[PDB]
Scaffold this active site. Structure first.
Site, PDB file in Angstrom:
ATOM      1  N   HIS A 238       0.813  -1.231   0.000  1.00 45.87           N
ATOM      2  CA  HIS A 238       0.000   0.000   0.000  1.00 45.87           C
ATOM      3  C   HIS A 238       0.845   1.280   0.000  1.00 45.87           C
ATOM      4  O   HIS A 238       0.505   2.231  -0.713  1.00 45.87           O
ATOM      5  CB  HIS A 238      -1.031   0.044   1.132  1.00 45.87           C
ATOM      6  CG  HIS A 238      -2.004   1.170   0.974  1.00 45.87           C
ATOM      7  ND1 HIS A 238      -3.110   1.052   0.157  1.00 45.87           N
ATOM      8  CD2 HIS A 238      -1.966   2.420   1.481  1.00 45.87           C
ATOM      9  CE1 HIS A 238      -3.726   2.220   0.227  1.00 45.87           C
ATOM     10  NE2 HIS A 238      -3.069   3.072   1.008  1.00 45.87           N
ATOM     11  N   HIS A 265       2.781  10.739   2.160  1.00 43.15           N
ATOM     12  CA  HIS A 265       2.193  11.792   1.324  1.00 43.15           C
ATOM     13  C   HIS A 265       3.040  13.033   1.207  1.00 43.15           C
ATOM     14  O   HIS A 265       3.332  13.482   0.084  1.00 43.15           O
ATOM     15  CB  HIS A 265       0.725  12.062   1.710  1.00 43.15           C
ATOM     16  CG  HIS A 265      -0.106  10.810   1.639  1.00 43.15           C
ATOM     17  ND1 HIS A 265      -0.146  10.027   0.485  1.00 43.15           N
ATOM     18  CD2 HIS A 265      -0.855  10.223   2.586  1.00 43.15           C
ATOM     19  CE1 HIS A 265      -0.929   9.012   0.773  1.00 43.15           C
ATOM     20  NE2 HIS A 265      -1.373   9.085   2.025  1.00 43.15           N
TER      21      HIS A 265
HETATM   22  C1  LIG Z   1     -16.312   0.568  15.240  1.00 46.26           C
HETATM   23  C2  LIG Z   1     -15.690   1.159  13.993  1.00 46.26           C
HETATM   24  C3  LIG Z   1     -14.252   1.577  14.241  1.00 46.26           C
HETATM   25  C4  LIG Z   1     -13.307   1.036  13.185  1.00 46.26           C
HETATM   26  C5  LIG Z   1     -13.087   2.092  12.127  1.00 46.26           C
HETATM   27  C6  LIG Z   1     -11.642   2.153  11.708  1.00 46.26           C
HETATM   28  C7  LIG Z   1     -11.473   3.169  10.596  1.00 46.26           C
HETATM   29  C8  LIG Z   1     -10.271   2.924   9.703  1.00 46.26           C
HETATM   30  C9  LIG Z   1      -9.782   4.235   9.120  1.00 46.26           C
HETATM   31  C10 LIG Z   1      -8.271   4.290   8.981  1.00 46.26           C
HETATM   32  C11 LIG Z   1      -7.857   5.621   8.394  1.00 46.26           C
HETATM   33  C12 LIG Z   1      -6.357   5.743   8.262  1.00 46.26           C
HETATM   34  O1  LIG Z   1      -6.062   5.846   6.874  1.00 46.26           O
HETATM   35  C13 LIG Z   1      -5.916   7.033   8.924  1.00 46.26           C
HETATM   36  C14 LIG Z   1      -4.429   7.271   8.919  1.00 46.26           C
HETATM   37  O2  LIG Z   1      -3.932   8.130   9.638  1.00 46.26           O
HETATM   38  O3  LIG Z   1      -3.728   6.452   8.053  1.00 46.26           O
HETATM   39  C15 LIG Z   1      -2.337   6.798   7.941  1.00 46.26           C
HETATM   40  C16 LIG Z   1      -2.096   7.221   6.502  1.00 46.26           C
HETATM   41  N1  LIG Z   1      -2.722   8.518   6.311  1.00 46.26           N
HETATM   42  C17 LIG Z   1      -0.618   7.248   6.105  1.00 46.26           C
HETATM   43  O4  LIG Z   1       0.015   8.501   6.415  1.00 46.26           O
HETATM   44  P1  LIG Z   1       1.232   9.071   5.472  1.00 46.26           P
HETATM   45  O5  LIG Z   1       1.326   8.155   4.124  1.00 46.26           O
HETATM   46  O6  LIG Z   1       1.246  10.557   5.208  1.00 46.26           O
HETATM   47  O7  LIG Z   1       2.536   8.558   6.270  1.00 46.26           O
HETATM   48  P2  LIG Z   1       3.435   9.345   7.361  1.00 46.26           P
HETATM   49  O8  LIG Z   1       4.923   8.857   6.891  1.00 46.26           O
HETATM   50  O9  LIG Z   1       3.191  10.838   7.327  1.00 46.26           O
HETATM   51  O10 LIG Z   1       3.079   8.505   8.728  1.00 46.26           O
HETATM   52  C18 LIG Z   1       2.951   9.167   9.979  1.00 46.26           C
HETATM   53  C19 LIG Z   1       3.870   8.543  11.024  1.00 46.26           C
HETATM   54  O11 LIG Z   1       4.189   7.177  10.713  1.00 46.26           O
HETATM   55  C20 LIG Z   1       5.616   6.994  10.776  1.00 46.26           C
HETATM   56  N2  LIG Z   1       6.097   6.032   9.777  1.00 46.26           N
HETATM   57  C21 LIG Z   1       5.904   6.315   8.441  1.00 46.26           C
HETATM   58  C22 LIG Z   1       6.287   5.537   7.424  1.00 46.26           C
HETATM   59  C23 LIG Z   1       6.968   4.276   7.789  1.00 46.26           C
HETATM   60  O12 LIG Z   1       7.340   3.521   6.908  1.00 46.26           O
HETATM   61  N3  LIG Z   1       7.146   4.033   9.133  1.00 46.26           N
HETATM   62  C24 LIG Z   1       6.731   4.846  10.171  1.00 46.26           C
HETATM   63  O13 LIG Z   1       6.930   4.503  11.333  1.00 46.26           O
HETATM   64  C25 LIG Z   1       6.246   8.379  10.704  1.00 46.26           C
HETATM   65  O14 LIG Z   1       7.440   8.496  11.475  1.00 46.26           O
HETATM   66  C26 LIG Z   1       5.157   9.332  11.146  1.00 46.26           C
HETATM   67  O15 LIG Z   1       5.316   9.768  12.491  1.00 46.26           O
HETATM   68  O16 LIG Z   1       0.073   6.061   6.540  1.00 46.26           O
HETATM   69  C27 LIG Z   1       0.041   5.938   7.965  1.00 46.26           C
HETATM   70  C28 LIG Z   1       1.021   4.866   8.385  1.00 46.26           C
HETATM   71  O17 LIG Z   1       2.301   5.221   7.888  1.00 46.26           O
HETATM   72  C29 LIG Z   1      -1.390   5.702   8.461  1.00 46.26           C
HETATM   73  O18 LIG Z   1      -1.361   5.783   9.885  1.00 46.26           O
HETATM   74 ZN   LIG Z   2      -3.273   4.960   0.764  1.00 46.27          ZN
END
Ligand SMILES: CCCCCCCCCCC[C@@H](O)CC(=O)O[C@@H]1[C@@H](N)[C@@H](OP(=O)(O)OP(=O)(O)OC[C@H]2O[C@@H](n3ccc(=O)[nH]c3=O)[C@H](O)[C@@H]2O)O[C@H](CO)[C@H]1O
Ligand SMILES: [Zn+2]
Length: 300
Positions: A238, A265
């Site tokens: 992903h 992102h």
């Molecule tokens: C009863 C009903 C209840 C159930 C309902 C459940 C609903 C489900 C919805 C889920 C929604 C999710 O979608 C929301 C969501 O936040 O999803 C995000 C997504 N946006 C994306 O964020 P983004 O691509 O920008 O990645 P960042 O690098 O900026 O990550 C940020 C931090 O991660 C560290 N990092 C980064 C890369 C790596 O390789 N390793 C590592 O450690 C890095 O140091 C930094 O502090 O990927 C993230 C992971 O990486 C996901 O958590």
């Molecule tokens: Zn995605």
């Protein structure tokens, strides 16, 4: 001549926006040669258009969010963009009546089926590609992303999660990109969330459209989804899908080699913008002679 591609017919997909939790109708329309990739907000009068431009990515907090000069937004564009990049769609009008693309199942696969159901059409104009002619790197602490000259398109991505569920899996994935390899290996990989994060965002009014039907939900120890993962290393597949989607913000396929460690992102947009701002690190290429096209860009 390697021709530009559009859709043969207008298609629709209705779902919920991941963050607003409100019903979104995505309408994909055929567009003529040289129009480019256009995102349209139909819910506004007059409607608001967003050309695919790296500089429109202004908020990279939760997803790749496009924002214009009057704070009009289109968010969660990356999964749909992956499908477009994967199938090489150059001309299309992407219409939404909500500030975001519907989450569907959390992967690019629903958007691929949608493009296929519509049918790919070739136009009497040459397809422009961004060819990387110099190495360009971007950093953000320990994380980095790079582009290097290469005759085709490849991706090598490394994740580093100190999580029992993610580390269990393979954290490095590398592939030679093609429409086929993307569909088979990447398109179906879903987004993932940590229950800690989801709960926090939900009390603040975000992630309202989130469920198990649209993401891999993880607690502090395991994957909570009944049926599990679609792949052993769905997490890294992903992250590569997001990179493909994000890099497609220039609205053209790239000829070059992408490498990343802990990218997201924000960093994907940073490299894209860094490459594009360095006049000598890239050029637009067309293929009047079909023989010159690298294998990576073969027909699906
Ligand atoms: C009863 C009903 C209840 C159930 C309902 C459940 C609903 C489900 C919805 C889920 C929604 C999710 O979608 C929301 C969501 O936040 O999803 C995000 C997504 N946006 C994306 O964020 P983004 O691509 O920008 O990645 P960042 O690098 O900026 O990550 C940020 C931090 O991660 C560290 N990092 C980064 C890369 C790596 O390789 N390793 C590592 O450690 C890095 O140091 C930094 O502090 O990927 C993230 C992971 O990486 C996901 O958590
Ligand atoms: Zn995605």
């Amino acid at each position: 001549m390697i021709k530009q591609r559009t859709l043969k017919r207008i298609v629709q997909a209705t779902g919920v926006g991941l963050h607003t939790g409100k019903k979104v109708t995505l309408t994909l329309r055929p567009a003529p040669a040289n129009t480019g990739v256009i995102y349209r907000r139909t819910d506004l009068n007059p409607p608001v258009d967003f050309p695919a431009d790296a500089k429109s990515v202004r908020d990279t907090m939760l997803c790749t969010c496009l924002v214009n000069e009057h704070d009009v937004r289109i968010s969660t564009v990356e999964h749909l963009n992956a499908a477009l990049a994967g199938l090489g769609i150059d001309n299309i009008v992407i219409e939404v009546n909500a500030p975001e693309i519907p989450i569907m199942d959390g992967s690019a696969a629903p958007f691929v089926y949608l493009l296929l159901d519509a049918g790919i059409d070739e136009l009497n104009s040459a397809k422009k590609f961004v060819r990387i002619k110099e190495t360009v790197r971007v950093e953000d602490g320990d994380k980095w992303a790079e582009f290097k000259p290469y005759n085709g398109f490849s991706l090598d991505f490394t994740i580093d999660f100190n999580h029992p569920a993610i580390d269990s899996s393979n954290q490095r994935y590398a592939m030679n990109f093609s429409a086929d390899a993307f569909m088979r290996q990447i398109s179906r990989a879903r987004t993932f969330g940590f229950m800690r994060d989801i709960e926090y965002l939900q009390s603040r009014g975000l992630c309202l459209g989130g469920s198990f039907d649209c993401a891999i939900v993880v607690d502090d120890y395991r994957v909570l989804n009944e049926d599990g993962l679609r792949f052993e290393d769905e997490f890294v597949r992903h992250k590569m899908l997001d990179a493909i989607g994000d890099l497609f913000m220039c609205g053209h396929n790239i000829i070059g080699a992408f490498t990343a460690y802990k990218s997201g992102h924000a960093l994907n947009n940073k490299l894209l913008q860094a490459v594009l701002a360095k006049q000598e690190a890239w050029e637009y290429v067309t293929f009047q002679d079909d023989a010159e096209l690298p294998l990576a860009f073969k027909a699906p």
